[PDB]
């Protein structure tokens, strides 16, 4: 069997401007097999109301998915994307870098 | 428009 560990990227749809409505994106890609759990956090806490794209895959057969929720960024709240997959010893968290 | 034909490996 092929097992691939997922690449993970957190970003906002539009550029972050506090108090402005936006969408928080967690793109995971290049993984196999297709079972994966993806969570989005506000200050360490799971966000309810999260959606994802339909399961698709690339030219090398690995899968990708886009998880996202509405949010309004603040000079205060910090965010992160937490992901679990068979190829991972522990769940991986990567934080939102507004100013990346 | 998906193909009606779908083969058995």
């Amino acid at each position: 069997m092929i097992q691939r560990t997922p690449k993970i990227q957190v970003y906002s749809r539009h550029p972050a401007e506090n108090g402005k409505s936006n969408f928080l994106n967690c793109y995971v890609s290049g993984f196999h097999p297709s079972d994966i759990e993806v969570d989005l956090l506000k200050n360490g806490e799971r966000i309810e109301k999260v959606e994802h794209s339909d399961l698709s895959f690339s030219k090398d057969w690995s899968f990708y998915l886009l998880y996202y929720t509405e949010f309004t960024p603040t000079e205060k709240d910090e965010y992160a994307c937490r992901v679990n997959h068979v190829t991972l010893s522990q769940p991986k968290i990567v934080k939102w870098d507004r100013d990346m | 428009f998906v193909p009606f034909n779908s083969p058995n490996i």
Partner: protein, 274 residues
Amino acid sequence: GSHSMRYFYTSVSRPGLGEPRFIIVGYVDDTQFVRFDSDAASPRMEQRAPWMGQVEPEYWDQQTQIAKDTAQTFRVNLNTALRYYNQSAAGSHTFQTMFGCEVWADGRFFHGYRQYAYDGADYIALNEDLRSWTAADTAAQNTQRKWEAAGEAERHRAYLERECVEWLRRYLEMGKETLQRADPPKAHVTHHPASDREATLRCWALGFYPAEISLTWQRDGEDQTQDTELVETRPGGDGTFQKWAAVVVPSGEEQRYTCRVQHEGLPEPLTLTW
């Protein structure tokens, strides 16, 4: 530029827990337009692009029927793969296809493909003549002999060179108001110190359709292809795309480095500096 219809099927089994999950997703160029997901009490092929509301209702019924019937043969196929590979009934496995057809801007067919994957590895493909089969191992070879006996490739060639083509054209026209559009990137550069006497330049490109783009860093002209770190082209989630490429620069030399962004939506290659 050119155009394509591309389809992607995934079937995953979950032994003990009932029947396999089967998902279909379909794209024209870089916009998804249909989906089929079998995890429903009554799954239906459904639109995912608004212009798809123009199809006559018989379409959704006919498409839903073919998907279920395909989902069924993928159950068979997964079970068959256990025999070919002498695997146990215990674990969950994956079976996939991807296929499609390409068309010039003028609307002329020029490429087709068909491919098959077991547990994430190449299984059997259709060669580019759309007539013969490349079987990746001794197991797939059993499927290769079957499909020559039954002359499978002809139905495949037929679909790929005819129905696929006729249909992509109709979709393109039906979604003219967006599909033949090309929004340009909206670029900008960002400054983050990377060391005492080293800094990182990051060249951004947001909001662009289609997803093909070139971000190149130049220093006085010559590319920094081996000294740039691009990130995967990612989706914005609204049908646009994003990318960035970044170079780490000896401090104070920013003006040396320049970023060229080519895109179908750019009347002329944008250039940018921090």
